[PDB]
């Protein structure tokens with residue numbers, strides 16, 4: 001209805017702002033754009049479901065997230081992909097892993113502080129009605 005697409009539009013506006021705040025953080029620069037296979041050719045073999053912050057923005061604008069849980073699933077995917085592609089003990093791998101866990105922790109912490117629990121519950125109940 002009108003009340004419901006208004007609820008989803010408010011979610012989209014909130015998720016855009018959060019994603020922008022993540023994307024401007026210097027720690028998360030490596031997660032801002034899709035991987036260039038020219039630059040890591042073995043990535044395509046390893047990472048079956050690639051995800052990055054520009055693609056998250058695109059999915060927001062495409063109405064793909066109806067709940068914050070849908071959004072955090074793709075943040076979780078950015079993180080798990082980074083851990084999967086960078087599993088080794090060497091410092092380059094460890095640096096990316098640390099940034100990936102920090103991206104995840106930061107996104108969850110913003111949403112805990114700033115997204116009203118009743119608003120998320122509303123989003124979920126509309127979603128389950130469709």
Ligand SMILES: CC(=O)c1nc(NC(=O)[C@@H](C)NC(=N)N)sc1-c1cc(O)cc(O)c1
Nearest residue numbers: 030031033034035036082085086092093096
């Ligand atoms: C996002 C990601 O997982 C990622 N991981 C890297 N790891 C490595 O370069 C080394 C340390 N490990 C290894 N090759 N196994 S570089 C990198 C990355 C991807 C981009 O699209 C842009 C960018 O600046 C960096």
